[PDB]
């Protein structure tokens, strides 16, 4: 019996940007009023991750990292109402508490509860559910899965089909459902349409996934790594380029294939410099371009204006816009109804304990997703 | 009668940067086939006809400005059927040519054959119609309406009620419709929301408007400009701020005052700065903010893609969205019928040759829309 005790378990703790993670045994205390105790089942390796190592997304370390994932409830704290134990469930990076303005707005997703805006890395009462050798951990943007256990405040979990498949519905808790939503719900691409997805990773591929649902009648792919454009095309692209093959710069070149610029334009990649081509790609008078990529902190853009005069719409989103508690259950439904398919983003699987060599497959451009199994 | 003939008449050239127009008499070319020569009534002062004084809007020079109009056709060229000599006509500075991919989307209206992206400062054909001193000069967006006399293409005209007060409805041709469409068109501004403006202008009056006919619950006008507040009220705004009054940036004020920031938010002054204050003024997860404000050409600004990773939106529109020939004639009619005023956008009348003192009038604050009568 494990409820209402401290479990000792493993985890993957980073204790300083740009280090390996390390494995090692971490104490997950029980669940406080209104949070919920898992035991993961399966965790994906995000770009986001990653971005914390490198210093691209700041959040304070030392940190159990891990966002996209699946488990089963352990234990519940008092006052939980919304799942129980053994239930499958997904943690959510972004909250949805129902009843701030934004959980309350028919659009908005990026419920104030987060702790993306201004990481504070713990649970919603300020405090740490984790320590390891005697030092507090920080949670990672209220879930923390890489570990076998985590502690979630309930806004930050929704209960799935009990016979969900976890090691594939793990990546509806990020990658899967960005990319889709992105498309489907934040750009609202049209039948008919042109589309340029910029970075054909996981996300990259799921915002080809959400266009080709929508009908678009060309979706250009663009990668500086080839060795991506083969799984781009068997989801949905409909071309690929590499700008490193081109004299010109890649605005001007799909500005050119487009015959006056895309319908539609995302950036999934990261970089302010693609930021910026992926909007000036978009045709002047009527394009849109969705930023989803997570840019270096604290580095500012540089722009024209005049790209938006014309007639531009540029925006961004979190979690592809999805209302996170309610939608993540629908997405899993989804899934089993055969209605999009995520074995594509599946490249790698590996026990969790192969955590450093999952990131060094992403690193060198091998992977999409690797999924770890615990 | 003068078909076919040169027309000797008076115009306001623009021969330097920076100095008074010079009123004096230039030849205008009879119309070529699908050309309308029209005889001016009516002409507002828009700060963009300022902005080519000032080097701000980059244009070839020497020109005859002035896009803000109403006049009669006096001629017509070969194969003109949608205006006859004597109709009422507004000059569109964006054309409407029914064929390119912009004029056939249903959202888009910066025409492809537009004057404005890459100024040449002709007719379509490349010619000009003008010469002054026995030198050729050249045209402002197709319409160049700073003259007793002007030849305008086709698809840059509308033919207007017959009834239409020419001294009124001239603002159709630039800041009533771009202001108001902003808000109604491009924004899409709700019911019940919470807007705010920044500039207290012709164009701002005209986005307040909008916001209030669009059922908007708060308006809040900001402007440097105190003495601008009074009208912004009268005309819709339910509160106003000045930023040189706070201690505080004005993004901060603004989204307190809407606890947590506004629904839409509109640039209507041409400030970077401004720019990125108004985008960063509106919520963070749902906001939409427009760029309406025409900066220094070829400058570029500096913001955090975070801004729009959240979830904004961030647009700019020409002429308010509106297909220029198509809607300008709806927008008469509508003003015939009373649905929207003009009235509090004229401040001062003048004859044309005091367009020197109605500039004056705009630079020293003093003014919403001096009207010139030939
Ligand atoms: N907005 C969100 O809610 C959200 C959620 C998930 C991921 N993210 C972000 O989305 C991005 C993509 O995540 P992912 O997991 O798919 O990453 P990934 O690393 O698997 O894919 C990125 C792709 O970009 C390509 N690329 C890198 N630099 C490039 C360049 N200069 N030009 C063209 N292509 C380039 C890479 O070769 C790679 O294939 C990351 O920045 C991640 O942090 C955002
Ligand atoms: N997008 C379009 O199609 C379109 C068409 C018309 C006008 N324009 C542009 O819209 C803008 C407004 O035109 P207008 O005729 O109303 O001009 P205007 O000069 O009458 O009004 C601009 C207002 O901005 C205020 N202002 C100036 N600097 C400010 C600052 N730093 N902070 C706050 N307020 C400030 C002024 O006091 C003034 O009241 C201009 O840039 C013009 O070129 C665009
Ligand atoms: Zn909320
Ligand atoms: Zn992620
Ligand atoms: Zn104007
Ligand atoms: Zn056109």
């Not at 015959?259 to 849109?288: K, P």
């Not at 997570?294 to 005069?309: E, T």
């Amino acid at each position: 019996s494990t409820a209402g005790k401290v479990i000792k378990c493993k985890a993957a703790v980073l204790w300083e940007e740009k280090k390996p993670f390390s494995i090692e045994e971490v104490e997950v205390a029980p669940p406080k009023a209104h949070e919920v105790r898992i035991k993961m089942v399966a965790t994906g390796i995000c770009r986001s991750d990653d971005h914390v190592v490198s210093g691209t997304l700041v959040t304070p370390l030392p940190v159990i990292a891990g966002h996209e994932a699946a488990g089963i409830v352990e234990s519940i704290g008092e006052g939980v109402t919304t799942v129980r134990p053994g239930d499958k469930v997904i943690p959510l990076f972004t909250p949805q508490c129902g009843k701030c303005r934004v959980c309350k707005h028919p659009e908005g997703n990026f419920c104030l509860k987060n702790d993306l805006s201004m990481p504070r890395g713990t649970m919603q009462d300020g405090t740490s559910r984790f320590t390891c050798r005697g030092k507090p951990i920080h949670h990672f943007l209220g879930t923390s899965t890489f570990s076998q256990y985590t502690v979630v405040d309930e806004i930050s979990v929704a209960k799935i089909d009990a016979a969900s498949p976890l090691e594939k519905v793990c990546l509806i808790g990020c990658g899967f459902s960005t990319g889709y939503g992105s498309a489907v719900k934040v750009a609202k691409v049209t039948q008919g349409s042109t589309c340029a997805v910029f970075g054909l990773g996981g996300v990259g591929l799921s915002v080809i996934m959400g266009c080709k649902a929508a009908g678009a009648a060309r979706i250009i792919g663009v990668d500086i790594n080839k060795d991506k454009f083969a799984k781009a095309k068997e989801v949905g692209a409909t071309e690929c380029v590499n700008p490193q093959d081109y004299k010109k710069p890649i605005q001007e070149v799909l500005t050119e294939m487009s015959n006056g610029g895309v319908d539609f334009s995302f950036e999934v990649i990261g970089r302010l410099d693609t930021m910026v081509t992926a909007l000036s790609c978009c045709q002047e008078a009527y394009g849109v371009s969705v930023i989803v990529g997570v840019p270096p902190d604290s580095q500012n853009l540089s722009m024209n204006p005049m790209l938006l005069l014309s007639g531009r719409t540029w925006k961004g989103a979190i979690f592809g816009g999805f209302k996170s508690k309610d939608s993540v259950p629908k997405l899993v439904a989804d899934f089993m109804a055969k209605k999009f398919a995520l074995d594509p983003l599946i490249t790698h699987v590996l026990p969790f304990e192969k955590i450093n060599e999952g990131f060094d497959l992403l690193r060198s451009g091998e992977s999409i997703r690797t999924i770890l199994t615990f």
